[PDB]
Design an enzyme around this catalytic site. Sequence first.
Site, PDB file in Angstrom:
ATOM      1  N   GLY A  19      -2.423   8.364  -2.526  1.00 33.29           N
ATOM      2  CA  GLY A  19      -1.081   8.447  -1.953  1.00 33.29           C
ATOM      3  C   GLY A  19      -0.148   7.356  -2.441  1.00 33.29           C
ATOM      4  O   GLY A  19       1.068   7.442  -2.262  1.00 33.29           O
ATOM      5  N   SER A  20      -0.718   6.318  -3.043  1.00 38.67           N
ATOM      6  CA  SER A  20       0.061   5.201  -3.566  1.00 38.67           C
ATOM      7  C   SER A  20      -0.792   4.391  -4.522  1.00 38.67           C
ATOM      8  O   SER A  20      -2.012   4.572  -4.590  1.00 38.67           O
ATOM      9  CB  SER A  20       0.547   4.291  -2.429  1.00 38.67           C
ATOM     10  OG  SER A  20      -0.551   3.646  -1.794  1.00 38.67           O
ATOM     11  N   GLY A  21      -0.140   3.492  -5.252  1.00 42.76           N
ATOM     12  CA  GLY A  21      -0.820   2.614  -6.189  1.00 42.76           C
ATOM     13  C   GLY A  21      -0.399   2.869  -7.621  1.00 42.76           C
ATOM     14  O   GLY A  21       0.720   3.321  -7.884  1.00 42.76           O
ATOM     15  N   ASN A  22      -1.335   2.598  -8.525  1.00 43.68           N
ATOM     16  CA  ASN A  22      -1.120   2.586  -9.973  1.00 43.68           C
ATOM     17  C   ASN A  22      -0.262   3.728 -10.542  1.00 43.68           C
ATOM     18  O   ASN A  22       0.661   3.495 -11.344  1.00 43.68           O
ATOM     19  CB  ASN A  22      -2.495   2.592 -10.670  1.00 43.68           C
ATOM     20  CG  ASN A  22      -2.652   1.464 -11.633  1.00 43.68           C
ATOM     21  OD1 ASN A  22      -3.522   1.489 -12.504  1.00 43.68           O
ATOM     22  ND2 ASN A  22      -1.814   0.450 -11.487  1.00 43.68           N
ATOM     23  N   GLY A  24       1.350   6.107  -8.564  1.00 41.36           N
ATOM     24  CA  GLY A  24       2.053   6.724  -7.438  1.00 41.36           C
ATOM     25  C   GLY A  24       1.186   7.806  -6.803  1.00 41.36           C
ATOM     26  O   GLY A  24      -0.031   7.655  -6.744  1.00 41.36           O
ATOM     27  N   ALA A  26      -0.981  10.816  -6.901  1.00 36.61           N
ATOM     28  CA  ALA A  26      -1.781  11.380  -7.982  1.00 36.61           C
ATOM     29  C   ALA A  26      -3.149  11.836  -7.500  1.00 36.61           C
ATOM     30  O   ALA A  26      -3.657  11.349  -6.497  1.00 36.61           O
ATOM     31  CB  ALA A  26      -1.952  10.356  -9.089  1.00 36.61           C
ATOM     32  N   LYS A  41      -0.794  14.035 -12.367  1.00 33.86           N
ATOM     33  CA  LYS A  41       0.507  14.006 -11.706  1.00 33.86           C
ATOM     34  C   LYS A  41       1.002  15.427 -11.610  1.00 33.86           C
ATOM     35  O   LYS A  41       0.839  16.198 -12.548  1.00 33.86           O
ATOM     36  CB  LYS A  41       1.516  13.172 -12.514  1.00 33.86           C
ATOM     37  CG  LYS A  41       1.188  11.690 -12.594  1.00 33.86           C
ATOM     38  CD  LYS A  41       1.288  10.978 -11.244  1.00 33.86           C
ATOM     39  CE  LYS A  41       2.674  11.062 -10.614  1.00 33.86           C
ATOM     40  NZ  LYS A  41       2.799  10.101  -9.477  1.00 33.86           N
ATOM     41  N   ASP A 131      11.337   1.586 -19.572  1.00 33.79           N
ATOM     42  CA  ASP A 131      11.206   0.784 -18.349  1.00 33.79           C
ATOM     43  C   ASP A 131       9.883   0.038 -18.419  1.00 33.79           C
ATOM     44  O   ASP A 131       8.819   0.557 -18.067  1.00 33.79           O
ATOM     45  CB  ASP A 131      11.277   1.680 -17.122  1.00 33.79           C
ATOM     46  CG  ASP A 131      11.360   0.913 -15.830  1.00 33.79           C
ATOM     47  OD1 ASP A 131      11.126  -0.314 -15.823  1.00 33.79           O
ATOM     48  OD2 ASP A 131      11.643   1.570 -14.805  1.00 33.79           O
TER      49      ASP A 131
END
Length: 272
Positions: A19-22, A24, A26, A41, A131
């Site tokens: 739900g979160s982390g490296n 997003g 995934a 993704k 980015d």
Amino acid sequence: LDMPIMHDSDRYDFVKDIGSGNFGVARLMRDKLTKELVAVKYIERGAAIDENVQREIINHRSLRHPNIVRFKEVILTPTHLAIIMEYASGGELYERICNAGRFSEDEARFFFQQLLSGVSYCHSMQICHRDLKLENTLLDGSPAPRLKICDFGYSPAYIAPEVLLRQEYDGKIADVWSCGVTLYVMLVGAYPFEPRDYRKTIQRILSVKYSIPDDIRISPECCHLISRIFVADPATRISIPEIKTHSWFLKNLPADQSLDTIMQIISEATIP
Ligand SMILES: [Co+2]
Ligand SMILES: [Co+2]
Ligand SMILES: [Co+2]
């Protein structure tokens, strides 16, 4: 989470939904043949599969380098486009710096060499103005972590002066500035143009006012290199080839799916 039902379980085992982390949001899967973890993704079919997404996938596919997250494949699902890629299990460089406080010159050089290798490679492929923030600089799960740039659009100090001043600018030269910010933060443990006042930071960026705190000792050669990156005039900013022959960089330096199939899948994904 905005993901479809598990699919293609004949080729992949399901490991975990993140739900979160490296990466997003995934899905982690394991390739049944090779046994390597992959990150998936997902983008909803239809309007969200826009030209920029298409362009990014195609450019991602072309980018083959040990310091860029490797594109694996795209798969069509009844509700989503699945974009499968190399998983990086070591988090992001932001977290590593945070935990360490700051890096030795050797550790900064170790990551800087890899970052420049990835960036220089993208430039050769005519991909630039990326980015390159710390959060997009992922790490693999090696003791000496391999850096894995992942800036692909599948969901302050970094901005060079000319990006604020000019409507159009040289994206490759702007990327060099970003690389300097990453070098600086690794060595210092804080961003070069800063407490939280955006305006102050932008003013500092535009007049190129930064200072290496006396609190920490940095070699004069390292100071010279940083001073050659943080140059407001894009014409005279150091280039990557010039960085690679700089004394600081050289010191103790380590040694250096079909396109039509992808197009059909992406194209069909535009139909919701
Ligand atoms: Co790139
Ligand atoms: Co370019
Ligand atoms: Co990414």
